[PDB]
Write an enzyme that holds these catalytic residues in place. Structure first.
Site, PDB file in Angstrom:
ATOM      1  N   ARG A  24      47.302  46.237  38.653  1.00  0.00           N
ATOM      2  CA  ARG A  24      46.997  45.538  39.735  1.00  0.00           C
ATOM      3  C   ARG A  24      47.553  44.162  39.605  1.00  0.00           C
ATOM      4  O   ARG A  24      47.611  43.485  38.598  1.00  0.00           O
ATOM      5  CB  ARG A  24      45.430  45.106  39.784  1.00  0.00           C
ATOM      6  CG  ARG A  24      44.549  46.597  40.262  1.00  0.00           C
ATOM      7  CD  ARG A  24      42.973  46.344  40.231  1.00  0.00           C
ATOM      8  NE  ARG A  24      42.589  47.761  40.525  1.00  0.00           N
ATOM      9  CZ  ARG A  24      42.418  48.155  41.568  1.00  0.00           C
ATOM     10  NH1 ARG A  24      42.132  47.218  42.621  1.00  0.00           N
ATOM     11  NH2 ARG A  24      41.550  49.211  41.711  1.00  0.00           N
ATOM     12  N   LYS A  61      48.071  51.251  43.972  1.00  0.00           N
ATOM     13  CA  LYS A  61      47.970  52.109  45.080  1.00  0.00           C
ATOM     14  C   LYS A  61      48.996  53.054  44.917  1.00  0.00           C
ATOM     15  O   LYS A  61      49.199  53.658  43.755  1.00  0.00           O
ATOM     16  CB  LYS A  61      48.031  51.341  46.315  1.00  0.00           C
ATOM     17  CG  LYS A  61      46.956  50.061  46.443  1.00  0.00           C
ATOM     18  CD  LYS A  61      46.683  49.825  47.864  1.00  0.00           C
ATOM     19  CE  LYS A  61      45.698  48.586  47.855  1.00  0.00           C
ATOM     20  NZ  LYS A  61      45.381  48.169  49.102  1.00  0.00           N
ATOM     21  N   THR A  77      50.743  45.297  47.211  1.00  0.00           N
ATOM     22  CA  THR A  77      50.338  45.538  45.704  1.00  0.00           C
ATOM     23  C   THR A  77      51.223  46.298  44.996  1.00  0.00           C
ATOM     24  O   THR A  77      52.211  47.127  45.602  1.00  0.00           O
ATOM     25  CB  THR A  77      48.728  46.319  45.934  1.00  0.00           C
ATOM     26  OG1 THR A  77      49.162  47.393  46.954  1.00  0.00           O
ATOM     27  CG2 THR A  77      47.958  45.565  46.784  1.00  0.00           C
ATOM     28  N   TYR A 137      51.653  31.329  28.474  1.00  0.00           N
ATOM     29  CA  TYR A 137      51.692  30.527  29.432  1.00  0.00           C
ATOM     30  C   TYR A 137      53.179  30.220  29.850  1.00  0.00           C
ATOM     31  O   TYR A 137      53.741  29.809  29.020  1.00  0.00           O
ATOM     32  CB  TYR A 137      50.827  29.156  29.376  1.00  0.00           C
ATOM     33  CG  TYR A 137      49.658  28.859  30.066  1.00  0.00           C
ATOM     34  CD1 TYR A 137      49.647  28.856  31.444  1.00  0.00           C
ATOM     35  CD2 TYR A 137      48.435  29.004  29.356  1.00  0.00           C
ATOM     36  CE1 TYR A 137      48.485  28.621  32.523  1.00  0.00           C
ATOM     37  CE2 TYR A 137      47.092  28.989  30.221  1.00  0.00           C
ATOM     38  CZ  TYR A 137      47.364  29.101  31.648  1.00  0.00           C
ATOM     39  OH  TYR A 137      46.296  28.732  32.392  1.00  0.00           O
ATOM     40  N   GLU A 194      54.246  28.923  33.344  1.00  0.00           N
ATOM     41  CA  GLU A 194      54.278  28.191  34.711  1.00  0.00           C
ATOM     42  C   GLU A 194      55.650  27.855  35.152  1.00  0.00           C
ATOM     43  O   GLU A 194      56.478  27.421  34.125  1.00  0.00           O
ATOM     44  CB  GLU A 194      53.345  26.967  34.644  1.00  0.00           C
ATOM     45  CG  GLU A 194      51.964  27.215  34.746  1.00  0.00           C
ATOM     46  CD  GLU A 194      51.000  26.128  34.364  1.00  0.00           C
ATOM     47  OE1 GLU A 194      49.835  26.186  34.887  1.00  0.00           O
ATOM     48  OE2 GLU A 194      51.237  25.056  33.636  1.00  0.00           O
ATOM     49  N   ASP A 228      53.327  44.398  55.391  1.00  0.00           N
ATOM     50  CA  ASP A 228      52.317  44.279  54.343  1.00  0.00           C
ATOM     51  C   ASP A 228      52.196  45.873  53.954  1.00  0.00           C
ATOM     52  O   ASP A 228      51.451  46.366  54.671  1.00  0.00           O
ATOM     53  CB  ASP A 228      50.929  43.659  54.811  1.00  0.00           C
ATOM     54  CG  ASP A 228      50.053  43.984  53.528  1.00  0.00           C
ATOM     55  OD1 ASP A 228      50.310  44.566  52.710  1.00  0.00           O
ATOM     56  OD2 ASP A 228      48.995  43.178  53.546  1.00  0.00           O
TER      57      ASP A 228
END
Ligand SMILES: Nc1nc(=O)c2c([nH]1)NC[C@H](CCc1ccc(C(=O)N[C@@H](CCC(=O)O)C(=O)O)cc1)C2
Ligand SMILES: Nc1nc(=O)c2c([nH]1)NC[C@H](CCc1ccc(C(=O)N[C@@H](CCC(=O)O)C(=O)O)cc1)C2
Ligand SMILES: *Cc1c(COP(=O)(O)O)cnc(C)c1O
Ligand SMILES: *Cc1c(COP(=O)(O)O)cnc(C)c1O
Ligand code: NA
Lengths: 454, 453
Positions: B244, B238, B235, B54, B56, B209
């Site tokens: 991903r 692709k 992304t 973690y 954050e 985008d």
């Protein structure tokens, strides 16, 4: 170039970083209650060819072809999830696509509420999550507070429990459409019967967000939110010990005239919020949910409970004070104000000796900007086969750091003064280097889930 | 129980399903233009102990400790992201935590816009993405259209291109605060400079985008939207061929100062996301290092040639292409002139192990069955396909189309067509024959990733 070369051969810079992180996880005392160590089994699914498949939509209802296998993985993951929480397929469905726990909460709000509809959650500094609605006096912080109207409920500062009386008083006035029963920093059980009574009176949906405690609920070592809740969200990591993902459980079938959660929830996840599912995560989650159904896991979870109260009792017996007086779950909230220290100071000392814990704002905090305490969790070290005596020794190592902290506080003024003293006084450095070495030696000797070297 | 047991030993049901998916990928002709095959090196980072941390917050500004190495990885990912797209760190920054492309776009919107502020993007059936705003006549579909006020812009059906003139006319009226330049199903290069003119005029942010084309942009085989956009989303999978995950690039420094950095970062965390997925961040870093190499430029050049070759081969067989051809990684086939539709062709092709997706043709409405097909080169080009191999893919497609035509002349409805392919024994043999020829052909080629999963 084939794309079949190893990481170690093709990107040595990144491979060395993975190794340092693995080493840091092995040598450390990981006491962040959100943290856990994922199984190698599930990590193999996560790092698989399932990353390569776009499968927008749902099983049998895809926007394009080639998803027959990926469909079985999703449907398997669902069944395994319903099984893990002992839910009847007729009365409960589940969505396995959320990218993490925060997406899962956002998806429920956008599924059931209109923009600016009202939400009530435990206030953040009283131990609620960001995604339960959190704004400050200056600005809106969680997107939950931007797109919806959140009013927090609070702790009774006398008991350190959820003030259920004020919640009922205050929900009558605010008229929320959704109330959230769930915590990031709360050592006790939530009265889901009493939450549902409030929710039944003011005609709100009850959302249980069991992220922190989902493993404990699956193992049946604490009572289940599913008895009283309409909707349950969770992480798949944390106590479920899976890959990072999220789940949304929802009631289905006949209400009293059917429930209408299923279609709304599924639509909010896709096509409203998300794109392609992370089928690799879904698979690693399915692996972890199978592990959660086994007697091995019920024993893991029982040990998590016992290790937590061993840490509590141990801290009580070194004279520390605990918010709510103890714990009925996987973590302990330690108020360091009654020891003459705070969370900020304790944390940075503990960090420098490879002990990683989380700050906690406590009910009794006289300063709003210096947290008074610390969250300490069992799950991570319990996954390394720690037992009660091992946690007593953890508490022992913590006590040394606190005591250095207390000694450095009286020889410093400000908080930045505190942290520079820890780095530059040779007598403090050496005591820290000593305690660190002893902590790392103690920790290294325990087993670790996952791959050996990354 | 140690949690060090292998997947094949500990969960054989799941391991068998992984192996089926791997075989399906290996034996198929993957023509979905958003698909690619992720390198093994990257997948090793993805399925790693970085799942366990973690973190954050951001590098040097985390909410708790133990993040020394994770800070280094995140910072390294940022450096390689700016390197791949040839960006000066003084002029551009990048956020590497978005959980995917769709999260990246929502985070940009919540950073820069108030609820109900106005957005314009390419309409979904004209080739835009759900996250650029999408509403039917009947309801709001994308969350982009719930929390914000979406009005689409459109193609000129005459040319198959974006009607930049109607965008300018219509943006003057609608007064969007953000306009999106980017596509899911568009075979041509976007005139980012013109998008920027319309944006400057109506006092709107320009977002590129670039999800579909990011790898092409990285390799410098097509023009870069970074010359004209303020914000760029993508992304990491692709054409970038990573795990991903998502990215948000943003201008910083001067023109007095830019104010994207702090707003974007805050929107990602704490506003929208929780803990970052560091395992994905590392996978993304690996794919971004790959994206800087001469190998990747050679790959991206090949993707263009392969798409060209696929288009020319389709043209020579008398198929119509939307916009007449392609300048990128995909081609849009209009099957109506041939007597078939996209829903019929998609399903026939699926059964012979060719995965493509149906595509609404310009001027048709969502209600009419889509007349076209979207065919992409990146996935097969990653399997070392060359121009002649894509000619051969088009041969197989032509057989699929020709079968679909025979079945259309023997069936009435679409549901009729779809179960005539299964139950009629003569057409199922014709399909089984093609499937086997397709699978034989496809299995010969190498596949990125692990051998068996
Ligand atoms: N109980 C709990 N729930 C949670 O979701 C989290 C925790 N604890 N602990 C760690 C992390 C922290 C979340 C978090 C982030 C920003 C602000 C915040 O108040 N930001 C303001 C004002 C700060 C200031 O007064 O200086 C800002 O605009 O910077 C509060 C909490 C997440
Ligand atoms: N260009 C493009 N961008 C994209 O983001 C996607 C694609 N294509 N293709 C696949 C998927 C499509 C998403 C998508 C979802 C819902 C509806 C929709 O219109 N739903 C209505 C009515 C549809 C009907 O009558 O069947 C509803 O039932 O609510 C359309 C498209 C994602
Ligand atoms: C940790 C947590 C979440 C989700 O966190 P992610 O980092 O988004 O997975 C949600 N709810 C609660 C109560 C949590 O403790
Ligand atoms: C695929 C795509 C996205 C979303 O990516 P996910 O990872 O599916 O959320 C966004 N924008 C465009 C233009 C895309 O092609
Ligand atoms: Na295991």
């Amino acid at each position: 170039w084939t794309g079949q070369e190893s990481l170690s051969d093709s990107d040595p810079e990144m491979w060395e970083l993975l190794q340092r992180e693995k080493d840091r996880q092995c040598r450390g005392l990981e006491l962040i209650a959100s943290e856990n160590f994922c199984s190698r089994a599930a990590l193999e699914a996560l790092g698989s060819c399932l990353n390569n498949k776009y499968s927008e939509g749902y099983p049998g209802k895809r926007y394009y072809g080639g998803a027959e296998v990926v469909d079985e993985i999703e449907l398997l993951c669902q069944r395994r999830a319903l099984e893990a929480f002992d839910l009847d397929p007729a009365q409960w469905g589940v969505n396995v696509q959320p990218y993490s726990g925060s997406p899962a909460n956002l998806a429920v709000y956008t599924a059931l509420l209109q923009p600016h509809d009202r939400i009530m959650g435990l206030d953040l500094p009283d131990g609620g999550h960001l995604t339960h609605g959190y704004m400050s006096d200056v600005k809106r912080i969680s997107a939950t507070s931007i797109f919806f109207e959140s009013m927090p409920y609070k702790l009774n500062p006398k008991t350190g429990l959820i003030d259920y009386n004020q919640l009922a008083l205050t929900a009558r006035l605010f008229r929320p459409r959704l109330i959230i029963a769930g915590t990031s920093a709360y050592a006790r059980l939530i009265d889901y019967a009493r939450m549902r009574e409030v929710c039944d009176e003011v005609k709100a949906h009850l959302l249980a967000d069991m992220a922190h405690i989902s493993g404990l609920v699956a193992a049946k070592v604490i009572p289940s939110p599913f008895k009283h809740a309409d909707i349950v969200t969770t992480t798949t990591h944390k106590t479920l010990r899976g890959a990072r993902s999220g789940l949304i459980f929802y009631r289905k079938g006949v209400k009293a005239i059917p429930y209408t959660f299923e279609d709304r929830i599924n639509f909010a996840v896709f096509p409203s919020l998300q794109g392609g599912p992370h089928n690799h995560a879904i698979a690693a989650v399915a692996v972890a949910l199978k592990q959660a159904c086994t007697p091995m896991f019920r024993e893991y979870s029982l040990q998590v409970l016992k290790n937590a109260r061993a840490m509590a009792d141990a801290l009580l017996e070194r004279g520390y004070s605990l918010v709510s007086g103890g714990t009925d779950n996987h973590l302990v909230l330690v108020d360091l104000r009654p020891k003459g220290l705070d969370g900020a100071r304790a944390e940075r000392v503990l960090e420098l000796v490879s002990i990683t814990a989380n700050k906690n704002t406590c009910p009794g905090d006289r300063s709003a900007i210096t947290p008074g305490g610390l969250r300490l969790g069992a799950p991570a070290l319990t996954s390394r086969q720690f037992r009660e005596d091992d946690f007593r020794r953890v508490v022992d190592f913590i006590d040394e750091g606190v005591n250095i902290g207390l000694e450095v506080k009286s020889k410093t003024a400000k908080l930045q003064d505190f942290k520079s003293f820890l780095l530059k006084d040779s007598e403090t450095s050496q005591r820290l280097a000593n305690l660190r070495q002893r902590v790392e030696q103690f920790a290294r000797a325990f087993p670790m889930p996952g791959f050996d070297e990354h």
